[PDB]
Design a protein around this motif. Structure first.
Motif, PDB file in Angstrom:
ATOM      1  N   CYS A   1       0.783  -1.249   0.000  1.00  0.00           N
ATOM      2  CA  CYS A   1       0.000   0.000   0.000  1.00  0.00           C
ATOM      3  C   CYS A   1       0.823   1.313   0.000  1.00  0.00           C
ATOM      4  O   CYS A   1       0.472   2.286   0.660  1.00  0.00           O
ATOM      5  CB  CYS A   1      -1.034  -0.100   1.128  1.00  0.00           C
ATOM      6  SG  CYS A   1      -2.001  -1.616   0.842  1.00  0.00           S
ATOM      7  N   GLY A   2       1.929   1.357  -0.743  1.00  0.00           N
ATOM      8  CA  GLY A   2       2.835   2.507  -0.847  1.00  0.00           C
ATOM      9  C   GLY A   2       3.643   2.491  -2.145  1.00  0.00           C
ATOM     10  O   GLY A   2       3.220   1.899  -3.139  1.00  0.00           O
ATOM     11  N   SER A   3       4.811   3.139  -2.148  1.00  0.00           N
ATOM     12  CA  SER A   3       5.692   3.241  -3.319  1.00  0.00           C
ATOM     13  C   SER A   3       7.162   2.983  -2.974  1.00  0.00           C
ATOM     14  O   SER A   3       7.682   3.487  -1.977  1.00  0.00           O
ATOM     15  CB  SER A   3       5.502   4.612  -3.967  1.00  0.00           C
ATOM     16  OG  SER A   3       6.371   4.814  -5.064  1.00  0.00           O
ATOM     17  N   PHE A  12      -0.158  10.605  -6.241  1.00  0.00           N
ATOM     18  CA  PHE A  12       0.489   9.756  -7.245  1.00  0.00           C
ATOM     19  C   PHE A  12       1.836   9.207  -6.764  1.00  0.00           C
ATOM     20  O   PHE A  12       2.150   8.046  -7.005  1.00  0.00           O
ATOM     21  CB  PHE A  12       0.658  10.547  -8.551  1.00  0.00           C
ATOM     22  CG  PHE A  12       1.135   9.696  -9.712  1.00  0.00           C
ATOM     23  CD1 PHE A  12       0.367   8.590 -10.123  1.00  0.00           C
ATOM     24  CD2 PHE A  12       2.344   9.991 -10.370  1.00  0.00           C
ATOM     25  CE1 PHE A  12       0.822   7.763 -11.164  1.00  0.00           C
ATOM     26  CE2 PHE A  12       2.779   9.185 -11.439  1.00  0.00           C
ATOM     27  CZ  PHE A  12       2.025   8.064 -11.827  1.00  0.00           C
ATOM     28  N   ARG A  13       2.595   9.990  -5.991  1.00  0.00           N
ATOM     29  CA  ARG A  13       3.886   9.639  -5.362  1.00  0.00           C
ATOM     30  C   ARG A  13       3.837   8.455  -4.366  1.00  0.00           C
ATOM     31  O   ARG A  13       4.883   7.981  -3.932  1.00  0.00           O
ATOM     32  CB  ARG A  13       4.426  10.950  -4.763  1.00  0.00           C
ATOM     33  CG  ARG A  13       5.844  10.891  -4.188  1.00  0.00           C
ATOM     34  CD  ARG A  13       6.346  12.330  -3.994  1.00  0.00           C
ATOM     35  NE  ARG A  13       7.746  12.379  -3.537  1.00  0.00           N
ATOM     36  CZ  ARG A  13       8.834  12.256  -4.268  1.00  0.00           C
ATOM     37  NH1 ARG A  13       8.776  12.022  -5.546  1.00  0.00           N
ATOM     38  NH2 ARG A  13       9.996  12.371  -3.704  1.00  0.00           N
ATOM     39  N   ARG A  14       2.640   7.951  -4.023  1.00  0.00           N
ATOM     40  CA  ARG A  14       2.410   6.672  -3.300  1.00  0.00           C
ATOM     41  C   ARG A  14       1.471   5.705  -4.047  1.00  0.00           C
ATOM     42  O   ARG A  14       1.079   4.686  -3.487  1.00  0.00           O
ATOM     43  CB  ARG A  14       1.963   6.908  -1.838  1.00  0.00           C
ATOM     44  CG  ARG A  14       3.001   7.679  -1.005  1.00  0.00           C
ATOM     45  CD  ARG A  14       2.769   9.197  -1.027  1.00  0.00           C
ATOM     46  NE  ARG A  14       4.035   9.932  -0.830  1.00  0.00           N
ATOM     47  CZ  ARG A  14       4.222  11.236  -0.807  1.00  0.00           C
ATOM     48  NH1 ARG A  14       3.254  12.080  -1.023  1.00  0.00           N
ATOM     49  NH2 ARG A  14       5.413  11.704  -0.586  1.00  0.00           N
ATOM     50  N   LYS A  15       1.131   6.020  -5.305  1.00  0.00           N
ATOM     51  CA  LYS A  15       0.217   5.298  -6.214  1.00  0.00           C
ATOM     52  C   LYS A  15      -1.198   5.090  -5.649  1.00  0.00           C
ATOM     53  O   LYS A  15      -1.835   4.079  -5.955  1.00  0.00           O
ATOM     54  CB  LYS A  15       0.870   4.005  -6.755  1.00  0.00           C
ATOM     55  CG  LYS A  15       2.300   4.247  -7.272  1.00  0.00           C
ATOM     56  CD  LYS A  15       2.831   3.153  -8.208  1.00  0.00           C
ATOM     57  CE  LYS A  15       2.326   3.339  -9.647  1.00  0.00           C
ATOM     58  NZ  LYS A  15       3.168   2.593 -10.615  1.00  0.00           N
ATOM     59  N   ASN A  56       8.357   4.881  -7.699  1.00  0.00           N
ATOM     60  CA  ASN A  56       7.841   6.194  -8.115  1.00  0.00           C
ATOM     61  C   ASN A  56       8.100   7.324  -7.083  1.00  0.00           C
ATOM     62  O   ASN A  56       8.076   8.502  -7.434  1.00  0.00           O
ATOM     63  CB  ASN A  56       6.381   5.999  -8.592  1.00  0.00           C
ATOM     64  CG  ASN A  56       5.320   6.766  -7.831  1.00  0.00           C
ATOM     65  OD1 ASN A  56       5.184   6.627  -6.627  1.00  0.00           O
ATOM     66  ND2 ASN A  56       4.496   7.532  -8.502  1.00  0.00           N
ATOM     67  N   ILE A  57       8.467   6.974  -5.843  1.00  0.00           N
ATOM     68  CA  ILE A  57       9.068   7.882  -4.843  1.00  0.00           C
ATOM     69  C   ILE A  57      10.371   8.548  -5.342  1.00  0.00           C
ATOM     70  O   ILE A  57      10.715   9.639  -4.890  1.00  0.00           O
ATOM     71  CB  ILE A  57       9.253   7.138  -3.486  1.00  0.00           C
ATOM     72  CG1 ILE A  57       9.998   7.935  -2.384  1.00  0.00           C
ATOM     73  CG2 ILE A  57      10.000   5.798  -3.655  1.00  0.00           C
ATOM     74  CD1 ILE A  57       9.355   9.263  -1.954  1.00  0.00           C
TER      75      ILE A  57
END
Lengths: 48, 111
Positions: free
Chosen positions: A41-43, B55-58, A46-47
């Motif tokens: 549930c995060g990145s 968007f930076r955590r989708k 793309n971070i």
């Protein structure tokens, strides 16, 4: 008249070593493995 | 005349005028306003920062991709609005002050 000190018949002779003792129990269990874990549930890309 | 400070002075008069003969039903006279103050940068600047921070955590994207959307297209629309935002920011406070078609020449000595 002397009877010659006559013995009993027939007794608890099969119990003369008997108590009896007890067996053992030990429960006690193994841990399951929960090491296959990751969050979604995060990145992670793309971070950047 | 009361202000130029809220008008783009390199557009000599920012104004388009018209006067129709017929008012709305139940009214005596009226006017309709349509304006573009570069202040409107804030709108899009809000939208393209609020977009980028989700968007930076989708977040939410799984619903979008599920209708087969492309994950690259977010990056593109938010980039395009950042260019559009930058457009107002560069045309706000832009020069009425003049510049000539004249180049540097090696025509003098040092003095």
């Amino acid at each position: 008249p002397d009877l010659k000190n006559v013995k009993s018949k027939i007794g608890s002779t099969e119990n003369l070593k008997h108590q009896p003792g007890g067996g053992k129990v030990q429960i006690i269990n193994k841990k399951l493995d929960l090491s296959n874990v990751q969050s979604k549930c995060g990145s992670k890309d793309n971070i950047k | 005349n009361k202000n130029s400070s809220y008008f783009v002075e390199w557009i000599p008069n920012n104004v388009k005028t018209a006067v129709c003969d017929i008012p709305p039903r139940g009214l005596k006279m009226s006017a309709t306003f349509i304006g573009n103050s570069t202040a409107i940068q804030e709108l899009f600047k809000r939208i393209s920062e609020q977009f980028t921070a989700m968007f930076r955590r989708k977040a939410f994207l799984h619903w979008y991709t599920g209708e087969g959307m492309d994950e690259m297209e977010f990056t593109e629309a938010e980039s395009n609005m950042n260019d559009l935002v930058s457009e107002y920011q560069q045309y706000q406070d832009a020069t009425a002050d003049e510049q000539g078609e004249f180049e540097e020449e090696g025509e003098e000595d040092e003095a």
